[PDB]
């Protein structure tokens with residue numbers, strides 16, 4: 001509406017300097033400006049500006065905004081010369097798309113490496129120096145490095161140093177057939193990172209808040225972030241540097257440089273009131289100090305303030321980083337690229353995939369599969385291909401009902417983004433639900449390969465605990481945290497069970513230990529039909545067929561002890577060998 005103001009910015013930037021300028025605005029001109037910080041605000045801005053609803057001005061790195069021209073969601077913009085001289089013209093170049101300048105350059109972000117000067121005389125300017133410093137600090141009681149291992153923005157400098165790239169620019173355009181994510185020095189960086197978590201130099205589970213927690217409480221020796229994050233380190237009491245990132249393979253690290261930009265809503269009649277706040281009270285000195293006292297913007301586009309905070313050696317080494325990197329593309333195919341790359345670092349540092357197999361899926365997805373949605377549908381199809389697979393395998397078991405509900409769940413989520421769009425489920429939770437399905441699968445996998453040699457209550461608990469997970473996975477009531485906490489219980493349950501007494505060779509043998517004699521029966525009939533059936537003469541077929549009927553009799557018995565089964569399998573793999581003359 002015309003009276004109130006709403007701005008969408010990210011809850012890691014100076015939103016609490018953007019409220020301030022709101023009150024240096026209401027208390028001046030009779031227009032209140034109360035400022036929001038939605039979650040996922042870059043991926044809801046599509047599905048709500050297609051309904052004529054959105055904040056009055058949207059703030060993000062310039063790389064999404066250009067998809068907001070391929071659906072018209074942003075409005076054209078035009079200031080005067082005494083103002084396009086007031087900022088730097090290369091940031092005007094970031095928001096330009098098809099001539100039509102479609103947003104306001106506020107400031108220029110860049111990931112810069114942050115260390116501890118109390119711990120470290122001088123940081124390792126080369127990335128290979130660092131594993132030799134974690135195994136040193138793996139004695140002092142501290143770590144070496146943590147940063148967000150969950151959004152690909154943070155890994156992309158390493159990947160890019162030896163020559164990973166998003167899209168090759170070629171005499172005017174980016175070539176959307178020439179993606180550089182599965183190239184050679186891509187694989188170098190990704191592989192190099194894998195090892196460090198692997199050698200417990202980092203942890204594959206580190207996210208934003210945990211790494212911001214870690215470096216500031218001061219356990220780990222280093223971190224990496226934008227300038228929005230010095231705020232909470234200014235706020236805590238760690239003595240740092242802010243340096244160039246290390247050089248992996250003698251080449252610098254190359255961060256994707258973001259321009260924090262301010263578009264303007266598509267269907268907005270507030271377009272007049274928008275381009276007033278943004279120039280007079282924010283994009284100035286008085287305004288930029290308030291947003292920068294809160295969460296530093298690094299290098300502010302505004303020549304008058306950039307030249308002030310330029311003496312700041314943290315910003316002079318933010319720039320040193322942002323010139324060794326590359327201003328991102330704003331083309332709409334970026335989104336599809338990021339998510340494609342997001343999946344691979346998740347899937348590598350974890351282990352679900354090898355560095356090469358990841359990057360090749362990531363490349364294919366980037367060159368064509370430009371649907372943020374169709375990528376998820378793929379991951380689920382793989383799960384159900386494997387869920388359906390693990391079903392026939394492990395069934396009649398304590399795990400049938402967790403399996404079959406997950407299968408139903410892998411199919412419920414899939415429509416929720418396709419032709420259904422009813423979505424009993426909230427949007428923030430989609431990705432969390434789907435990644436949790438990977439966590440369900442790995443628990444069905446853990447439980448079938450390590451618990452089957454125990455008392456059935458070990459297998460009872462996990463059986464129930466995986467069903468609890470698929471339930472929260474399917475509950476519209478469960479929020480993103482309600483799920484993650486449930487996912488860490490199923491991981492917590494896997495330790496609890498291993499405490500239980502292993503089965504005892506006199507005990508009534510559990511289905512699982514009868515699941516082992518049954519696999520020998522299937523192996524022996526398959527080997528028998530293949531290498532005996534016509535092959536050797538029937539007198540010896542008969543006196544193997546009996547050892548099957550006998551070995552079946554042992555697992556139709558309910559009162560069979562473990563020991564009575566163990567020695568029955570020895571029979572077959574000495575009676576199938578007896579029938580190998």
Ligand SMILES: OC[C@H]1O[C@H](O[C@H]2[C@H](O)[C@@H](O)[C@@H](O)O[C@@H]2CO)[C@H](O)[C@@H](O)[C@@H]1O
Pocket residue numbers: 010012060061063064109151152153154258335338339342
């Ligand atoms: O990592 C994927 C994500 O990266 C970029 O987002 C950055 C953003 O540029 C910064 O404003 C800040 O919020 O950190 C973000 C990642 O943690 C891209 O802008 C975005 O499209 C992409 O999905």
